[PDB]
UniProtKB/Swiss-Prot annotation, chain B:
Location(s) in or outside the cell: Nucleus, Nucleolus
Record-annotated OBG-type G domain positions: 166-319
Residues engaged in binding GTP: 172-179, 218-222, 278-281
GTP-binding keyword on record: yes
Family: Belongs to the TRAFAC class OBG-HflX-like GTPase superfamily. OBG GTPase family. NOG subfamily.
Keyword Transferase on entry: no
Complete-protein stretch covered: 4 to 465 of 642
Molecular function terms, GO-annotated: GTP binding; GTPase activity; RNA binding
Gene Ontology cellular-component annotations: mitotic spindle; nucleolus; preribosome
Organism: Schizosaccharomyces pombe (strain 972 / ATCC 24843)
Protein name in UniProt: Probable nucleolar GTP-binding protein 1
Entry superkingdom: Eukaryota
Swiss-Prot record, chain C:
Its biological purpose: Component of the ribosome, a large ribonucleoprotein complex responsible for the synthesis of proteins in the cell. The small ribosomal subunit (SSU) binds messenger RNAs (mRNAs) and translates the encoded message by selecting cognate aminoacyl-transfer RNA (tRNA) molecules. The large subunit (LSU) contains the ribosomal catalytic site termed the peptidyl transferase center (PTC), which catalyzes the formation of peptide bonds, thereby polymerizing the amino acids delivered by tRNAs into a polypeptide chain.
Basic and acidic residues compositional bias, start-end: 1-9
Name of the protein: Large ribosomal subunit protein uL3A
Family the entry assigns: Belongs to the universal ribosomal protein uL3 family.
InterPro entries per record: L3_arc_euk, Ribosomal_L3_dom_3_arc_sf, Ribosomal_uL3, Ribosomal_uL3_CS, Transl_B-barrel_sf
One Pfam family named in its UniProt record: Ribosomal_L3
N-terminal signal peptide: none
Annotated positions of the Phosphothreonine modification: 352
Subcellular location(s) of the protein: Cytoplasm
From Swiss-Prot, chain D:
Transmembrane segments: none
Compartments it resides in: Nucleus, Nucleolus
Biased composition range(s): Low complexity: 25-35
GO cellular component labels: nucleolus; preribosome
UniProt family annotation: Belongs to the UPF0642 family.
Name used for this protein in its record: UPF0642 protein C32H8.05
Regions of compositional bias (Basic residues) in chain numbering: 11-24
One example of a Gene Ontology biological process annotation: assembly of large subunit precursor of preribosome
Organism, as annotated: Schizosaccharomyces pombe (strain 972 / ATCC 24843)
Curated annotation (Swiss-Prot), chain H:
HAMAP family membership: Ribosomal_uL14
Major subcellular site: cytoplasm
Gene field: rpl2301
Matches recorded under Gene3D superfamilies: Ribosomal protein L14
Family listed: Belongs to the universal ribosomal protein uL14 family.
Official protein name in the record: Large ribosomal subunit protein uL14A
GO cellular component: cytosolic large ribosomal subunit; nucleus; preribosome
Record's subcellular location: Cytoplasm; Nucleus
Species this protein is from: Schizosaccharomyces pombe (strain 972 / ATCC 24843)
Amino acid sequence: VSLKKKSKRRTTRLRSRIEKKAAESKRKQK
Amino acid sequence: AVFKNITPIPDVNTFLDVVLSRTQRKTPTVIRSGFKISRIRGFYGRKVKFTQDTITEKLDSILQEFPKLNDIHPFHADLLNILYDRDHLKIALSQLSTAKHLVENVARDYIRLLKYGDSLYRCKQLKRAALGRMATIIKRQKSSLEFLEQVRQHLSRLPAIDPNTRTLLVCGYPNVGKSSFMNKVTRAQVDVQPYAFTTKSLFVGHFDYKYLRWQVIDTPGINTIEMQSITAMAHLRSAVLYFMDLSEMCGYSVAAQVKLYHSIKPLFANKVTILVLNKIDAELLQTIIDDGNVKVVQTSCVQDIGVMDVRTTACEALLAARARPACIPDSVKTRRAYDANDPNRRILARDIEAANGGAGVYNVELRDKYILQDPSWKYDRMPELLDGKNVADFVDPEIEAKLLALDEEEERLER
Amino acid sequence: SHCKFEQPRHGSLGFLPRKRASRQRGKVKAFPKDDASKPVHLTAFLGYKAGMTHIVRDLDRPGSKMHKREILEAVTVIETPPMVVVGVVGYVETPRGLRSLTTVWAEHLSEEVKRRFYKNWFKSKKKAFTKYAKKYAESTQSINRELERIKKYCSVVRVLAHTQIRKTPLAQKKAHLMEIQVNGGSVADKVEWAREHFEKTVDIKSTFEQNEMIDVIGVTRGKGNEGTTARWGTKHPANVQWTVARAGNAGYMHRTQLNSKIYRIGAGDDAKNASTDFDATEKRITPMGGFVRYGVVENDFVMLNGATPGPVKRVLTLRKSLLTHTSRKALEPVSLKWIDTASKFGHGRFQTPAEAKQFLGTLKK
Amino acid sequence: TSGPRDNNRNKWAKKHLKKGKRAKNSNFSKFLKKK
Amino acid sequence: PQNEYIEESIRKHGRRFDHEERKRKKAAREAHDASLYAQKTRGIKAKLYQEKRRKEKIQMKKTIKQHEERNAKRMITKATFVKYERFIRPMALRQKKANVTHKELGVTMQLPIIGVKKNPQSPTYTQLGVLTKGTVIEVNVSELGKYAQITNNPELDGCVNALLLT
Amino acid sequence: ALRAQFENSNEIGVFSNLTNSYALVALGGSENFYSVFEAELGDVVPVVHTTIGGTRIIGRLTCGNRKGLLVPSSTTDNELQHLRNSLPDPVKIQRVDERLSALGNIVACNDYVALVHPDIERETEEIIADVLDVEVFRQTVAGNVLTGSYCALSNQGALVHPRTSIQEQDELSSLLQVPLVAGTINRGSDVIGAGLVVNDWCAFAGLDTTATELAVCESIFKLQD
Amino acid sequence: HFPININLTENGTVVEIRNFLGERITRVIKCLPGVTVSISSAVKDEIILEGNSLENVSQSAANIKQICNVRNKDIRKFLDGIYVSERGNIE
Amino acid sequence: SRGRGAASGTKYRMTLGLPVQAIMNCADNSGAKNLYIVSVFGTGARLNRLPAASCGDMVLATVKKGKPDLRKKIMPAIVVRQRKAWRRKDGVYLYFEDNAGVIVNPKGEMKGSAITGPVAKECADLWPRIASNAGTVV
RNA sequence: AUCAGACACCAGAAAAGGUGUUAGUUCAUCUAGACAGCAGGACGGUGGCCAUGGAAGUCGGAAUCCGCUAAGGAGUGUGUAA
RNA sequence: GGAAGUCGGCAAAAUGGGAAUCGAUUCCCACUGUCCCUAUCUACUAUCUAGCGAAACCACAGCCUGGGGAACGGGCCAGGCAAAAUCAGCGGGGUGGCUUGUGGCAGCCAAGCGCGACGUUGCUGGCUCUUCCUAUCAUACCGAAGCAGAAUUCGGUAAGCGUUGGACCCACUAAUAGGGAGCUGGGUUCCUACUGAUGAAG
RNA sequence: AAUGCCGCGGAGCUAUCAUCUGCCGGAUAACGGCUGAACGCCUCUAAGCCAGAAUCCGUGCCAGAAAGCGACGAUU
RNA sequence: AUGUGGAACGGGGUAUUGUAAGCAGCUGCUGAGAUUAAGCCUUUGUUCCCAAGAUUUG
């Protein structure tokens, strides 16, 4: 059983949005 | 003036934490950017308003619970003067009220700007700008809140005085037997110690005599304690109970006590003082005796002799200044009063009860005490109805005779 | 969005489904816990709701607002003729539950209990239990073997008893047969008690004793299909859930009234059963003109407080309370003062015709 | 006020069952049991 | 009860029998209690606990440091200051006093805004008197007329905090 | 003069009635009230744990003296039989068919003279004189009709309202042939009868009665000896 | 003010306690195995729990102290209770 | 504390026949004539249920017609008579022919001195002061 | 891990907290006896001076010196009206 | 009991009426199932039966949870599940892992890497409805506080159970806590679900 | 006489407009402790243990798998 | 499916209403008359009817 309050599995928009904005973070720190 | 009913004042940090925690817990928490701008504005407006309401609610509670020094009996007002510096207390209370108005002004200002919030963020910071200003306002009265809490704690300790009632103020030299007289007269447990000025503050104790209750107020011996003692007798319809050490066993000279009493006579005027000769068992006094109002009653403090007589004399002085043959049964003339400890005392139904299960379980037998030719039938059931008639309508001690008379009559009719 | 004005739920979720009971006879879904410290005793009885009346009793309730006053209470009268024990069932405890290992029947079975096995007694050739009677007469050693099996392996002993419905003034001829668990004693003791009680009648005088607290269980009156108004007390896109009140069956559900007090266990052969120490006035529990829609009570009867589920002439099961509960209401004695037996078929005004005749004039008839 | 699920209420209810308040039920059962 | 009645009770009857040993045990196990609190609690209470433990930790590090060396609708959406007025400037968003902080003096004075010269974001807002970030506003300096630049955003912060041009 | 509370109520006259030959206490509450009465009158007069019409206001429902007792119409037969069995033979009991059921409120009666509600029925007055064997007089107390509730009677003393005038004080004393004092009971409550029950040799008042009031009742009732 | 009443049954394996701050209740404990409770006459109102298992004796002590607990009263003034005074061995 | 204030005994459940907005007769000699019911003490949280009172219940009352100084106080009132029939616990059904009540303080002693008309014994038992100052108790 | 992890630059919360564990880096004393533990000493000028009802190191204002040493701080806290 | 209902005497009963202000409004009296609070009675329909006998609509159909980048859907993914044939009801179904409790300017430090953290100092919409969440108003149990007692404040576990009646106001109440997922007023000029009822069958 | 109008009106239905009924076993959370290390002291915790909330799980109560089952009776 | 069998009426009890028509002389017959199970109780009362037709079942 999950035994959690928040699901450990992520949606495809959410997982795609990390690589969208993680790269921009490296752009900003550059 | 029971000053115990004042709610306890939190320090500035707990006050802010309680207010902010209440705002978080009692108001809605979740909002999304996609919501209508009216709902966003209303959302943050509620938090600012709710936080304003919690702060004033607490601050008003302080401002109302504290006693208004001007509206109270000048005995207590001057007592609060010597202890708390009315000006400092008044400044502290005014600072909170000025804070309260400031908390209201900031909230009204930020609610007004929130009506024009265009994005979820610009409302978010007005709320953050709001609550921070509300908090920074409160943080500035750290001294005032701390001061009021200390005042609160000592206020709850003060005795509940009532100058309206009959009183008898007891003042004199420190540890000069006044504490012993107060302890012997009133039920108050006044501590007696070799240390001088053991009674730091006043001690009020009630005493019942002459079908009335008198509130004897013992004052500090004679500083702040001396000032409080003076103000205690300053405004009080009572009589002085000065106790002078006759044998000087209290450590104070008799002449010094007489001189102090003469100096304090200006405030002790319009009262019937007492020239108590304390420590009797253990010249200058002529001038004091020349006043006449002082009652020269010997007080054998070591032997505890004369305390009751002195108290009775003081109470009397204060009061002055302010055919049907009842056939009682013979058993009544020799009835032993029901006192529990004695063995000869009979039992009561209360004791039968605690033995037989106590309140709610014991069934009292109502029938158990019937005057009756037998104790056995004492639980019988008397027939009430029979064949449409009550048995009661027919209960007659000679009813057998009416039945026999009748027999003869029916025997006549059949014949 | 939240509900603005809230109220408690209009129904009870613990009593649904509101479907018709699959039985007419009250089922015992729980028998009182057994104990070997106490030897044998029964735990249930089967009666018929004749009718209900009201009584006056002196209330000896310590601490009450009406301590030692005369109180009026409604009472239900259930006729309880003695029931004949005709069988014993052994139950073995298994990791899957209580399982009926075997059953032993008495040799002579009355037509009362034989009618239970048929939907039409007249067309049948009455062949039931005939070969069982033959083998009982031939060899009793076989029957001794099943009883040995019951007392050796089984952990719960129950007796099959049927009510003598013939004695009651009921138009039904089938007897109601049920199992009463023999609580108390060892399994051998229960088996013996069943053996010496075969074919003999056990009466309510031996089951209950006029003061204890019992659970009365039965099927309620049928009100037919009803809308949400009287079935349930009713004043986002989704699908309708089970919690939403709906229209359907109202009535004829299996119910259990707890904590019923017997005010009196009267004997049918006695003619003083409706008379008390404060009343005299020889009378019977049957009201003047007979019970409405039931008849005349001529056998042993039980008078319970309050009301019991189901209409008149329906079968009720009376079981001993599962759990001891020593509320002083459950522990106090009862001393009846007066019982009402006026005509319930209308506004009755007289208790018995005898005492009505003195008040009324000489009727021409 | 505490409900019936209260562990305290269960405890002194058990205390009542532990004493003579249930002994009136034992001899009550024994009477019919013997007769 | 009069004045310090509880220590009169303490003096006359003593304190509770187990108080000293119970408080010793509680103080001893407080070390484990703090760590248990830090590892169990979640949410705001954890977060305030985290921030207050950081504050106290930095504080105790500083005093042990101090111990050391001593031993050694056409409407305007921005706040404005007071045909051509085609848009609506709410009197609510309008402001009249600003907190101008002197650079050299380092003193913040709340003074009225005499006027606004130009808004760097939009010169059109200068006519309407809209105060934005970096806007130039002139205020009276008699109590200290001088110009200043807005150091914050009046729309968001609400209070017009500006830095004097001196 | 003693202080007692029925349950936690200051009105003991309502829940009890006391005479010179018997005592009546309410039933079904706490017998601590019965316990207190027995502690002072158990060895002198019988104490009856009685109710009147299934009710506990027996003090204000029944009026009596050392000779006889009266009960209202609402008195049940069982309770009347209970009272007769409890009380001794030389005491007589009477039902009253009075419209004014509150006998304890309409009749204030001592062993020799009784003063009654002005609008009492003639038949009630005649049977009162027959049973109580006292002279009956129709008059109001301080302009107030409830004589039994607003006035307490004993053989040697009595109390009335503090609202009565001095001339009313003198007239009432002259018509009663007993010393009478204007006073109050239970700390300012002008229901003297409801707050006080007195026989010829002892007095009971509520626990909230002041010390001054107790001294007044003791002074008028001469109970120090 | 209220003396505490102590009763010992089944040679000290069950302790009944009465009148703790004027209680009408009967607080009953059953001692853990290996523990016997006695009342010593050397000092008044002295309870002694003797046994072999330290855990059983000391857990019995904790049970007594916690069951005789003051509720809703100010403990800075209300000092009534039962407390462990000395811990040691029989010899 | 007003709710069961100085009751000196519990009341049995009685049929409610005087809800709020009721207009009902004053029974004391204090001078008031008519009373208007504003609220009843001891009513919980029942949705849409109109607050109601029975004999011996204490209500909030306004003197519609009466002496002016008797007015301008929402004064506690004790309902002493009720027209709706109710079951006395002994079994008999009772109903007085008019709805009557008395003006009383929150503590439980009225401003009046004598009650005109019959008094329910339930009222007289929860309120010993009314019983003390009642003329006929039925 | 009494709401573990399988996540995917662990990038939003993110700054950090933990008497949880395993590894390291830099400084410390240690058979001239290490840390801890129990036994004891922890002083005398001196109750240093203003400050006070009462303050003796410990309500409170600058230090805070000395005879002895192996060490006893005008004193780390509790506590005492003192 | 007598408009307490509703935005409101809509509709009935009093037979509709008495006085005021500008037909309308208000007031007092009067009446009444609008309401507390629904219950009962009658006729018709609905139900079944004999006869007759349509139409709209129709890719195919028919359970829910999480995901399927979106539009989440019924078809796809992973699960819960899943047993013929039916009857009568009622109508449900035709866009940040956001966000929350702590404001803006300047200076002083300074763990450390010109910044520099915490600190520190300077100033001005309402009527009824099923369920869920806890972020708890009350009830249960605890800790702390000048908490003597009573009453009370704050905080913890806790959503089991309650959280009203009237025109922000005034009462009751232990309390009148906050939110998520059939209807009307003033304001701008088939099938499936749910609920009951049968029902072939080892 | 389309229930002409009125009074009473059994039976049935019904009314917090009437009456009755609504119960006990474990496991825990906050929290209070026992023994006891880690760390030669200490420690409610690490291994274990005790007490402990209207909480959770059962008992009780309702339904009875129409594809879960047992015993008994007869068997053309 | 021949039985303490059932049904239709009848009597009695119990209830509802209120004292009938008629005979008469408001009064008496006359607390009478009418109704009473259609979801009231009872029946040595009379009469009547049933030991039958079909269907499915190893």
